[PDB]
RNA sequence: GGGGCCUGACUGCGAGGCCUGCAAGCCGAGCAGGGGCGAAAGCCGGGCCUAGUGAACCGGUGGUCCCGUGUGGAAGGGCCA
RNA sequence: CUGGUGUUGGCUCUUGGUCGCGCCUGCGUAGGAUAGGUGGGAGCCUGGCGCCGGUGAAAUCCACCCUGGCGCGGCUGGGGGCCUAACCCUCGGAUGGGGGGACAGCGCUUGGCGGGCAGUUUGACUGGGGCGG
RNA sequence: GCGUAGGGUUAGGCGGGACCUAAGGUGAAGCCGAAAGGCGUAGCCGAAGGGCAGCCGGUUAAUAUUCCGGCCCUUCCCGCA
RNA sequence: CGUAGGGAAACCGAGUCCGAACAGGGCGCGUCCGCGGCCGUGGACCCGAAACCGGGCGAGCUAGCCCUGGCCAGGGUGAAGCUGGGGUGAGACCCAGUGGAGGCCCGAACCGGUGGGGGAUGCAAACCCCUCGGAUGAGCUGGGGCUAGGAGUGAAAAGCUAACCGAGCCCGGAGAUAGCUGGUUCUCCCCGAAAUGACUUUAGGGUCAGCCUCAGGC
RNA sequence: GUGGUUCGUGGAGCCAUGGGGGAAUCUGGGCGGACCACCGCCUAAGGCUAAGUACUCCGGGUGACCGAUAGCGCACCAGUA
RNA sequence: GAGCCGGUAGCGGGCGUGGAUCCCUGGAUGUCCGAAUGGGGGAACCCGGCCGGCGGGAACGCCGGUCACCGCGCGCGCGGGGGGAACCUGGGGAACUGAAACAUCUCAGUACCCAGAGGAGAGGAAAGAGAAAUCGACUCCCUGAGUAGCGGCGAGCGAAAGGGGACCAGCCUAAACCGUCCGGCUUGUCCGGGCGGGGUCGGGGGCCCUCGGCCGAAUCCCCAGCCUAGCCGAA
RNA sequence: UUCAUG
RNA sequence: GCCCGGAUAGCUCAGUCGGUAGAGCAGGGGAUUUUUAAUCCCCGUGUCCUUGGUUCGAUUCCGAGUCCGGGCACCA
RNA sequence: CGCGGGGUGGAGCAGCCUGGUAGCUCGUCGGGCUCAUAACCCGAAGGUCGUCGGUUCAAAUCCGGCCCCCGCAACCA
């Protein structure tokens, strides 16, 4: 997917099982295949002027923290570079 | 999610009525319609900079 | 076959063998604890005998003077059933 | 495909667990008598007795309240709406206009369906092998 | 037609490029992908398709719509009207 | 490493453990090199797979499609129309003419390959001759392009995809694996088997015992 | 929900983190292998940090390394025909 | 320091003890392609624009500059782009094999692909390790040890502590607070934004009055020494 | 209102 | 292996949320009866699974046990 | 030629549970109805349970095995 303020997606195994499970009886595993857990992504739209992010939606309050700002500069037309490099 | 209210609204009305609205209600209606701001500590003392200039300065 | 009394269809072991490629399988006098039966000698560690079964592993269940990840304890293990 | 939550909101109409609240509920007898279970048991309104007498248990008053049901409300879980701001599709290009609309899309996760795809297994003696045993 | 050496391929007009697009590429913008990259608007590339000014004869050992002979024609630039 | 071992362990110790047991029984004392035999993991004695997977390279053959060009000699049948006539109330309809339609007919190029013959270390890793099928169409073909490996493409045969496709080729994992077949290279001397039992997803293999050899002790 | 570590769900801590809930800043917070209470240990969610180590296209020397089928695939005009 | 004009052998043609040939170092020219970078491209070719130059000329020419794209700060400027036999880190990541079948597992986080980076990379100063009123960054080697363990408890995989060594080193930042300044507003004795000053278990820091106080870089110029040509070298 | 044949 | 529900007549079942035991079908008898059904009226085949227990008296409530119908779950 | 499946009343079939408790429809016989046959109604009755041998207290039941009948196979060459 993407990143915009966070780290990219990861790679998981699956690890199926078909058992009772230790606290009942004998356990097992079955098949270790690669689920590819694409991280939660939401196109958020903010009004710096018209700006759009692909933010992680556990980081929507973080991008509203980034919008609750006044970084002294007017419009070149696009400008998320000064919103993302004046991030901490 | 607490917001300081700046306008009348039905079932949450007074200015400074810091009501725990739902997050989508905050970040989708009130924040693009000016009716409320997020009640962090810095914006809470920015509210307080007006509360000190209004409430104890009418009297 | 019948009658009486019962629980030895015990717990610890077990010299010695049989057998076998190992693993298994089988017999086992004797000693102790504690009983059964009998007056006592003795016999009884399942059935007249050879079939009626299943290594391991992983679990369960009941105990246990064992281990308990610094220490006390639990989790979970072991051990015995 | 599907539930849960995320993005994901607003305002309403209704079904249970609920926390206590309480006008109230319990009825084969002998008995003024809209009869519950257990205890306090010497009366309590401006007009009602308890021992009046008989009971497995005496009643009044008043709790613990059981069994519910009725409503009054917060912790509520649901299913039905209407809205528009998320979101999506759009529109002789629009900070806007529609329309869908908290649904879809998409994230995780639960369960399912799943030869569409994949990794494999499909024993041995066997008077060849298979069938049979 | 093999070996050695030497010659030989002459274009404003023929075919391409200083022109154009088709399929398809590439691709600013924009989108999406873990990265490689995959798309994609405009644009550009893309050709025996469109468009564009030439015919006839001779010459050596080889070239000739190129060289040369005749006639014609095209673009551009400058000057005059 | 070895000097202490038992036990699952706490632990105890020439003892330990099972146990109530001071019955019984189980178990109870060298290294470092060199060299050799052998074994383990190594590719492990060498050759050889069919294959599997990763990354690439190919649609100049062929299969399809897209764009753009071309090609199809010649005859023949004679459709709809159209024209005139017949007909009728008007028509439908029916005649002649005209017209030129067709996955129409015969047929060359062209495409193909039906039957036979030749060819068979060929002329040719698919040919030649005779004969055939289509030949104005679902045609053929040049150019420009697209699609690719469990994928393309397929008027479907599992065909085609660079001369062998039930999953291309090349490199890499990779010296894959092979209980299989082949092969194993100087000389002498001594001793010398087995093809049986048990067990095997085991029957051509293996573990153990049987038979064999070597060294030591008796 | 998974990966890493010896750890394959196990008694699963720890380190990372894709989803969801979601704090405090020293009477904070994490860790000492479920967890809990004592005793310790240590400060996450910001970054840099030589040195020693791996390597060998390269240059040099070294060889109980090869001597043209060997040694690199090439001692030669070879990654050539 | 006397022969040369490369692998010369041949035209004979020159050139050198006023110093050549060579070798090293530093420049210059480096056509065209290539990250290719003006645009196109079927690489080594075409087609340009702007400026400056040669009826050589206004048209075609040629020369010499400059013309990609991206990232960083104020039209303006410094980097990046690709390559490299291996080595390394991160993102992905098999399968044959082995388990005498096989699926968990193993092969293996191997090969391979991608990114990045450099002479190394990585990691790194403790929210560490785990039994010691202990060790004190990280890395590497040997031990630990095939141990502890993990394990269809099969196949197999397999640490870490401790302990020897090498090497040695610690540091910057909001472990808040003060001023600065484009603007924020409800002109607030104030929100966040850039710096700057503070700040790094006389447990830390900022703020409040005693008792005042310089060690040394990883950074920088230096210098040996090292190479990159060689030279003298006994009989 | 049922019900086949000599 | 746990988890539900049930044991009521010859059979299938409801239970005033303790004060009375019941349907429906079957069986029989009776009425009409061309045929058999259908219809009509009336009776039963009844320790309400077994005991223990709580209550004044138990199908009801409580536990145990047995058969009894399932639901899931592993299955070394 | 080898598996597996049946044999039960005149016929077609239930069956029969570790073995002891055998039937259903039609057919049959007798009656009733009918002028008479159908149909219908009422009473019963009928079977060595494929032969055979086996363990059994006892076989139709269970174990073989043999004869008819059924369903299957009889493939790779
Ligand atoms: Mg497992
Ligand atoms: Mg695997
Ligand atoms: Mg949105
Ligand atoms: Mg007796
Ligand atoms: Mg033995
Ligand atoms: Mg034995
Ligand atoms: Mg035996
Ligand atoms: Mg016996
Ligand atoms: Mg096993
Ligand atoms: Mg520990
Ligand atoms: Mg402990
Ligand atoms: Mg014992
Ligand atoms: Mg209203
Ligand atoms: Mg009530
Ligand atoms: Mg009485
Ligand atoms: Mg009520
Ligand atoms: Mg209500
Ligand atoms: Mg409600
Ligand atoms: Mg609506
Ligand atoms: Mg709109
Ligand atoms: Mg399936
Ligand atoms: Mg398959
Ligand atoms: Mg495999
Ligand atoms: Mg066989
Ligand atoms: Mg056979
Ligand atoms: Mg020649
Ligand atoms: Mg001309
Ligand atoms: Mg031309
Ligand atoms: Mg030009
Ligand atoms: Mg062009
Ligand atoms: Mg186009
Ligand atoms: Mg593209
Ligand atoms: Mg362009
Ligand atoms: Mg052209
Ligand atoms: Mg043309
Ligand atoms: Mg010629
Ligand atoms: Mg010519
Ligand atoms: Mg002319
Ligand atoms: Mg002893
Ligand atoms: Mg040796
Ligand atoms: Mg495989
Ligand atoms: Mg390709
Ligand atoms: Mg082609
Ligand atoms: Mg085709
Ligand atoms: Mg006509
Ligand atoms: Mg015609
Ligand atoms: Mg035709
Ligand atoms: Mg063909
Ligand atoms: Mg042919
Ligand atoms: Mg023909
Ligand atoms: Mg033909
Ligand atoms: Mg034809
Ligand atoms: Mg024809
Ligand atoms: Mg024709
Ligand atoms: Mg074509
Ligand atoms: Mg082509
Ligand atoms: Mg195919
Ligand atoms: Mg082929
Ligand atoms: Mg195949
Ligand atoms: Mg393939
Ligand atoms: Mg091989
Ligand atoms: Mg391998
Ligand atoms: Mg001899
Ligand atoms: Mg074998
Ligand atoms: Mg042997
Ligand atoms: Mg011998
Ligand atoms: Mg020997
Ligand atoms: Mg374990
Ligand atoms: Mg504290
Ligand atoms: Mg922590
Ligand atoms: Mg710690
Ligand atoms: Mg913790
Ligand atoms: Mg601990
Ligand atoms: Mg470094
Ligand atoms: Mg080192
Ligand atoms: Mg050398
Ligand atoms: Mg030699
Ligand atoms: Mg030599
Ligand atoms: Mg040679
Ligand atoms: Mg060689
Ligand atoms: Mg030679
Ligand atoms: Mg060469
Ligand atoms: Mg020369
Ligand atoms: Mg000089
Ligand atoms: Mg010179
Ligand atoms: Mg020179
Ligand atoms: Mg120059
Ligand atoms: Mg260029
Ligand atoms: Mg270009
Ligand atoms: Mg070119
Ligand atoms: Mg001049
Ligand atoms: Mg000039
Ligand atoms: Mg230029
Ligand atoms: Mg600088
Ligand atoms: Mg690079
Ligand atoms: Mg595998
Ligand atoms: Mg295997
Ligand atoms: Mg296998
Ligand atoms: Mg591994
Ligand atoms: Mg370094
Ligand atoms: Mg670092
Ligand atoms: Mg530290
Ligand atoms: Mg180590
Ligand atoms: Mg250490
Ligand atoms: Mg150390
Ligand atoms: Mg130091
Ligand atoms: Mg500020
Ligand atoms: Mg500071
Ligand atoms: Mg002070
Ligand atoms: Mg100096
Ligand atoms: Mg010096
Ligand atoms: Mg030198
Ligand atoms: Mg000298
Ligand atoms: Mg000398
Ligand atoms: Mg009737
Ligand atoms: Mg009738
Ligand atoms: Mg008749
Ligand atoms: Mg008559
Ligand atoms: Mg009942
Ligand atoms: Mg009953
Ligand atoms: Mg009930
Ligand atoms: Mg009825
Ligand atoms: Mg009835
Ligand atoms: Mg009755
Ligand atoms: Mg009764
Ligand atoms: Mg009862
Ligand atoms: Mg009772
Ligand atoms: Mg089971
Ligand atoms: Mg019968
Ligand atoms: Mg019969
Ligand atoms: Mg009759
Ligand atoms: Mg056949």
Beta strands in chain B (DSSP E): 2-5, 19-20, 36-38
Scanning every residue of chain B, which has its alpha carbon at the shortest distance from the alpha carbon of A45?
A: B28
Choose among B37, B28, B40: nearest CA to B6.
Answer: B37
- What is the length of chain B? 59
| Alpha helical stretches, state H, chain A | 60-67, 81-84
List all residues 6 or more positions away from A28 whose beta carbon is below 8 Å from its beta carbon: A17, A18, A19
C1' of E36 to CA of B2 (Å): 46
Neighbours of A44 (CB within 10 A): 19
B47 lies within 8 A of chain A by CB: no
Distance from CA(A31) to C1'(F45), angstroms, rounded: 40
CA B5/CA B47 separation, integer angstroms? 10
Q: Is the CB of A1 under 7 A from strand G?
A: no
């Amino acid at each position: 997917s993407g990143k915009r303020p966070i780290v990219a997606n990861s790679i998981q195994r699956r690890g199926k099982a078909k058992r009772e499970g230790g606290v009942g009886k004998k356990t097992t595993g079955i098949s270790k295949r690669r689920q590819y857990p694409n991280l939660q992504k939401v196109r958020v739209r903010v009004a710096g002027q018209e700006i759009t992010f692909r933010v992680a939606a556990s980081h929507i309050p973080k991008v509203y923290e980034l919008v609750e700002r006044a970084k002294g500069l007017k419009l070149e037309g696009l400008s998320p570079k000064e919103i993302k490099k004046e991030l901490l | 999610m607490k917001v300081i209210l700046l306008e009348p609204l039905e079932n949450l009305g007074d200015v400074g009525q810091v009501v725990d609205v739902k997050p989508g209600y905050a970040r989708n209606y009130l924040l693009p319609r000016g009716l409320a701001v997020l009640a962090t500590e810095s914006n809470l003392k920015a509210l307080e900079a007006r509360i000190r200039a209004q409430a104890k300065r009418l009297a």
